[PDB]
Structure 1
């Protein structure tokens, strides 16, 4: 399948070169997989989600996304126009308030929630969790992410936006999950992207168009935007049967575009997520 005039990041993940604008992908499109977006919520009524998104849990007075961040991230995972995996099921877990903030205890509870809640959902092709959040190092936060991964969920986490070594941030620094840095449309490391040996992969993160609250769209930047590209890619590859939740991060690294990014610090992987789709 081909989506013309796609957001640059979608085109990038199906291309061996920057500078194109068509996204190519197998029409299975993540059908039968599920992606949890652990964030500020999801505006599931947005036409872009086509009935495939739903809120399953909140720790606050509403499950609605009063911020936009979670809706944007969910759109990059699986919206019809802005998403990598256009037929996946999206489940929202609101661990962040409408200012985008959340306590680590709530975030940990949300991760353990997903590890159990997947047993209440139909995801025959596999389960992914996208975590576009983080703060300073916490062994308890890292352990929660490790549990979620161990339970059979492909965990993708943002590296962080500090232009610093991600070893000092959580859950970015957890070795067993997939830690995602950000790149721009010219294959440069995004100016704000964290780096370091704990990164597994880069995805598009600068000037990413996706869904927003109020049935709208906007372009924003962050490792928060790169992470759902990788989460959606994992769901897509799991539906194709090419990998599993436990092996998808390694598979994405194995099949990435290699050595194509600029300003990658010595010791950080030079790997850009790529779907290897041959039309």
Structure 2
């Protein structure tokens, strides 16, 4: 398959080089995989989700995404136009309030919820969790992300937007999950992207067009935007049977574009998510 004039991030993950415009991807498009978007929720009614998104849990008065952040990330995972895995199933877990903030206890509960809830879903190609959130280092947040990963879910988490070492942020600092930094369309590290040894991979994160609430779209930046690229890529690759939840992060790093990125401090992987698609 080939989406012309795709968002640059989608084009980038299907190219060995920056600057392309077409997103090349296998028609399977993550069909049969499921991605939990643990965030502010998802506006499942967005036409761009084609009925493939649904709220499964909220820790607030409503399951409605009153912010847009979760709807944006979900769209990068699996919306028709802005998504990596255009046929995946999206499950919304609203651990963040409509201001985009969430208590660590609620984020941990949301992670434990996904580890259980996935056992009630038909996800033959496997389960992914996209965590475009984080705060200061927390052993308990890290332990929750580790549990989710151990439960058999491919956990992708944002490195953080502090232009610092992700070692001091959670769940970014949890070694066992897939910690995602952000790059821009010119293959530089996003100016805000955290770095450090705990990063496993980079994904497009600067000026990322995706779904927004009110059935709209908008472009925003963050490791929160790179994370769903990698989550979608994982779902996409799991559907192709190229990898499993336990090995998806390592596989993506092994198959990533190596050395393409600039502004990568010594000790940080220079690896950009890449789907290695060949027509």
Q: TM-score range by the shorter chain?
A: over 0.9
Verify: 1:104 aligned to 2:104, yes or no.
yes
Distance apart, 1:125 and its partner CA:
0.3
Distance apart, 1:152 and its partner CA:
0.2
Distance apart, 1:261 and its partner CA:
0.4
TM-score, length-scaled by structure 2: 1.00
Deviations 1:201-233 (A, max 9, x none): 000000000000000000000000000000000
5+ residue gaps, structure 1, are none
Deviations 1:114-149 (A, max 9, x none): 000001100000000000000000000000000000
Between the aligned partners of 1:59 and 1:175, the Cα distance in structure 2 is 26
Distance apart, 1:171 and its partner CA:
0.2
Distance apart, 1:52 and its partner CA:
0.3
Distance apart, 1:103 and its partner CA:
0.3
Between the aligned partners of 1:20 and 1:271, the Cα distance in structure 2 is 18
Between the aligned partners of 2:277 and 2:68, the Cα distance in structure 1 is 31
Between the aligned partners of 1:2 and 1:75, the Cα distance in structure 2 is 18
Between the aligned partners of 2:55 and 2:209, the Cα distance in structure 1 is 22
Between the aligned partners of 2:59 and 2:79, the Cα distance in structure 1 is 25
- SS of equivalent residue, structure 1 residue 143: helix
Verify: 1:9 aligned to 2:9, yes or no.
yes
Distance apart, 1:44 and its partner CA:
0.2
Verify: 1:193 aligned to 2:164, yes or no.
no
Deviations 1:156-208 (A, max 9, x none): 00000000000000000000000000000000000000000000000000000
Aligned to 1:261: 261
Q: Give the total of aligned pairs.
A: 279
Between the aligned partners of 1:106 and 1:2, the Cα distance in structure 2 is 39
Aligned to 1:70: 70
5+ residue gaps, structure 2, are none
Between the aligned partners of 2:267 and 2:144, the Cα distance in structure 1 is 27
- SS of equivalent residue, structure 1 residue 261: coil
- SS of equivalent residue, structure 2 residue 100: coil
Aligned to 2:251: 251
Aligned to 2:157: 157
Aligned CA-pair RMSD: 0.3
Distance apart, 1:24 and its partner CA:
0.2
- SS of equivalent residue, structure 1 residue 93: strand
Distance apart, 1:38 and its partner CA:
0.1
